[PDB]
Write a protein that binds this DNA or RNA. Structure first.
Ligand SMILES: [K+]
Ligand SMILES: [K+]
Ligand SMILES: [K+]
Ligand SMILES: [K+]
Ligand SMILES: [Mg+2]
Ligand SMILES: [Mg+2]
Ligand SMILES: [Mg+2]
Ligand SMILES: [Mg+2]
Ligand SMILES: [Mg+2]
Ligand SMILES: [Mg+2]
Ligand SMILES: [Mg+2]
Ligand SMILES: [Mg+2]
Ligand SMILES: [Mg+2]
Ligand SMILES: [Mg+2]
Ligand SMILES: [Mg+2]
Ligand SMILES: [Mg+2]
Ligand SMILES: [Mg+2]
Ligand SMILES: [Mg+2]
Ligand SMILES: [Mg+2]
Ligand SMILES: [Mg+2]
Ligand SMILES: [Mg+2]
Ligand SMILES: [Mg+2]
Ligand SMILES: [Mg+2]
Ligand SMILES: [Mg+2]
Lengths: 211, 108, 86
RNA sequence: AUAGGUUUGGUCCUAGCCUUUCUAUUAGCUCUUAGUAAGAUUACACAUGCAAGCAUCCCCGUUCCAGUGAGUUCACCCUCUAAAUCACCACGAUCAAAAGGGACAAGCAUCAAGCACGCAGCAAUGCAGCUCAAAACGCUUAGCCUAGCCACACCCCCACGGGAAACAGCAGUGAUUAACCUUUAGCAAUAAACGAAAGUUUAACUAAGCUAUACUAACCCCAGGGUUGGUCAAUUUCGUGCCAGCCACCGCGGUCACACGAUUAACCCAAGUCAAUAGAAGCCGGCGUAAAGAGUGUUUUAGAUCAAAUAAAGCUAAAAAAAUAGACUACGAAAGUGGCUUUAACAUAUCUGAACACACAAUAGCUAAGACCCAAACUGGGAUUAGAUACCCCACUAUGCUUAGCAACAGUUAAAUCAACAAAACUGCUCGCCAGAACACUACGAGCCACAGCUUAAAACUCAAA
RNA sequence: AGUCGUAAAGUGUACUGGAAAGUGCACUU
């Protein structure tokens, strides 16, 4: 097999060009507010976002106006406020702005999440930092905002099996000699229903490629 | 041949079949260059109507025109098929009647 | 490198599509055999570097057009057939 | 193949070609309806319109599906082990890359050598090795092993770069070919993408359009196509007269043509028919005379069971080459060896196996020198009828001389021995050879020659014989 | 084709300039 060297050359030069043309947040996540399009790609934002894009602030649009970029402060989201009655917020621990931005209104942030009044053990990276969704909790309101009394979260611990599976399980028991009359049950306390709007791992998320 | 010899030589290998005047095609389109007549080989006597044609493959060939009476002229387009004219040596092609310029034989 | 200087060339009557009418030779590099169509007189312009000279000769290999294949795609090229050995 | 026709004055054998059967494409002529299946000749060029979105922004997808068959042992099995899915804490299962081992198309030896193709050592370096007539190396051909798989995605194998401006996605078009489907609708079903989801998108797909290409079922009325000498089912009358014309093979036509043209009638199949083309379809048969087996011995990786010679020295008798013995039949591998003495000396405890290894042997034809008694083609001379003798006689060359060169082996006679003719048939085992005439014909050319002569070929092509 | 006329011996090879075939060398019955 005649070795294909041009393929290797093309792969290496393409990789080099990619690593030396990594776009920045200020370019990737800029938006034209009249047409609601990303200038970087030309793609329009979804309709259901349009209103918020014209009304709400990105996270670093708030943090760039704070000392130390607002470490220790509490930030919540409009969608969380509309969706949930219990307090949902991030307690900021680290911020790394995009210094190339004119208003320093793009970048990454880390914090400790409290979702529906339940706080997490460790600090992780915040997703949706580039979304027009964020609100800063005033310091004179934090005590009122964080006040949460954990309600009794007593949910069902077991459910019936589906009819056919239940019948098959009972038949297997009866065939193996067991005469127990206890209903077969499916355990679900270990399956915790995680809300669809709970923050995901921003560390595992991908990034738009430069082009 | 012994079993060892047949194992060595292997299965019989039929030579590739010979392509005929049509080069393995049902019919061929051709342009008439000239019309004439040829005489049969002799247990027989006649003036068989023939025409030289340039085929679509570029090769030139002599073809037999069946039926009584034909109106083929130079530069006319014809479709030629296989089939040897048994009494004419070297004439392996026949003109198809009723296709392109070559029309059907007139009744009676 | 010298510039390419031009030289106008007129070819004789085309002697069919299988016999060359001229070989335009570019000194020692090689040559090009031209077959016009019947009766056709062609006008050509050959460019060769200034120091060297361009020579039109009666064909050395006049039936060299015949060794070829079929046109590939819309390209002017013909498929190349290796010649019989010596 | 359950076979058939065709070589001859006739019989038998051998052998080619063709017929009968089943498919596919195309063409002629002819075609009513319904359901289903399938559907450019071209990796040639393409106008136009569509074929990828989704989603509260991030991401994800557009790397799939769909297409083509250009190139071509990347596909399969085992080992190891990424990415992906689910466990989602991984234990690990599933799926499957890269890598290591194995396997994996056809033709041509007129492709026989490849030319670094190997090993050992931590390395330095050392060894000289590796593949191959059991087919290496090379050229040509082709998508394949089809629940599908492989390869490609305009070209430069690749695609940074360049040529250059891309339907081998759907519909459609140009050119080309014997080959020729709508520039329909819908995301209602399934599949895919995205979404938490209601859902959205999709020329995948689904449902339609066209086409006797096929299958199935019809049809009250409505049938065509071919054939009719034999193979092979089936002709009346005229017309024509070796002309016109016809045939798959053999063949018919010259005044009574079942073979051509028309007409009548019959036969076969039938919404078809059947002209051309291409497939399906075939070596366990033979080698004295038909195509095919001897110059001798040895060896050779394997396979099988069948474990009076010759060379040297001397010597000679009758008239250099050897009468008698020899009515002998020995020696030697063969060719060959038969005067006497002496000296060396006559391989091998199974068989088959060489173009390519070593020894011999014979047969042509030329080349160098050498001898020359005798004979002697050619070449001269003499004698002879009434085209003498072609033929007798003389002389003398090439040459005759001498060097050096260019079916096997073992067992059987039991059986119907037994196409014939030879030479009574047989088995087993191995090697070589054979798949019409055709060891045909032919000089495109090549060499020598140097304008006009000589030497040197296969294949096509044709035929139904030989 | 008639329309036309008539009833010792061999095989090879070489040379042949008195070649309707001859001679030379080797073979066969
Ligand atoms: K998405
Ligand atoms: K292919
Ligand atoms: K390619
Ligand atoms: K759908
Ligand atoms: Mg026969
Ligand atoms: Mg499709
Ligand atoms: Mg893994
Ligand atoms: Mg692999
Ligand atoms: Mg191919
Ligand atoms: Mg490419
Ligand atoms: Mg198309
Ligand atoms: Mg294309
Ligand atoms: Mg078709
Ligand atoms: Mg269709
Ligand atoms: Mg649509
Ligand atoms: Mg359909
Ligand atoms: Mg008739
Ligand atoms: Mg038809
Ligand atoms: Mg023979
Ligand atoms: Mg032996
Ligand atoms: Mg003498
Ligand atoms: Mg042998
Ligand atoms: Mg003489
Ligand atoms: Mg003689």
């Amino acid at each position: 097999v005649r070795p294909r060297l041009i393929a290797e050359l093309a792969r290496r030069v393409r990789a080099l060009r990619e690593q030396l043309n990594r776009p920045r947040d200020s370019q990737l996540y800029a938006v034209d507010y009249e047409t609601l399009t990303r200038p970087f790609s030309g793609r329009r934002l979804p309709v259901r976002a349009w209103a918020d894009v014209r009304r709400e602030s990105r996270l670093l649009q708030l943090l760039g106006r704070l000392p130390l970029f607002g470490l220790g402060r509490l930030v919540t989201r409009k969608s969380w406020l509309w969706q949930h009655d219990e307090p949902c917020y991030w307690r900021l621990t680290r911020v790394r702005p995009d210094y190339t931005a004119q208003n320093l209104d793009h970048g990454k942030a880390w914090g400790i999440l409290t979702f529906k009044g339940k706080t997490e053990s460790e600090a992780r990276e915040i997703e949706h930092v580039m979304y027009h969704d964020w609100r800063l909790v005033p310091k004179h309101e934090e005590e009122a905002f964080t006040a949460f009394t954990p309600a009794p979260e007593d949910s069902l611990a077991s459910v019936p099996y589906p009819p056919l599976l239940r019948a098959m399980i009972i038949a297997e028991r009866q065939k193996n000699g067991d005469t127990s009359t206890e209903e077969p049950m499916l355990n679900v306390q270990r399956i915790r229903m995680e809300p669809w709007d709970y923050p995901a791992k921003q560390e595992d998320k991908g990034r738009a490629k430069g082009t | 041949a012994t079993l060892n010899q047949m194992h060595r030589l292997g299965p019989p290998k039929r030579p590739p079949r010979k392509l005929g005047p049509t080069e393995g095609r049902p019919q061929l389109k051709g342009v008439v260059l000239c019309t004439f007549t040829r005489k049969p080989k002799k247990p027989n006597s006649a003036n068989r109507k023939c025409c030289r044609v340039r085929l679509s493959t570029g090769r030139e060939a002599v073809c037999f025109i069946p039926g009584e009476g034909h109106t083929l002229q130079e530069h006319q387009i014809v479709l030629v098929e296989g089939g040897r004219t048994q009494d004419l040596p070297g004439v392996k092609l026949t003109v198809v009647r009723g296709k392109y310029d070559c029309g059907h034989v007139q009744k009676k | 490198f010298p510039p390419l200087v031009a030289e106008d060339i007129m070819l004789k009557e085309g002697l069919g599509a299988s016999e060359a009418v001229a070989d335009i030779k570019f000194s020692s590099a090689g040559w090009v055999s031209v077959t016009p169509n019947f009766k056709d007189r062609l006008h050509l312009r050959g460019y060769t570097p200034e120091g060297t000279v361009l020579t039109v000769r009666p064909p050395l290999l006049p039936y060299i057009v015949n060794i070829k294949g079929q046109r590939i795609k819309k390209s002017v090229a013909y498929k190349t057939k290796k010649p019989p050995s010596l």
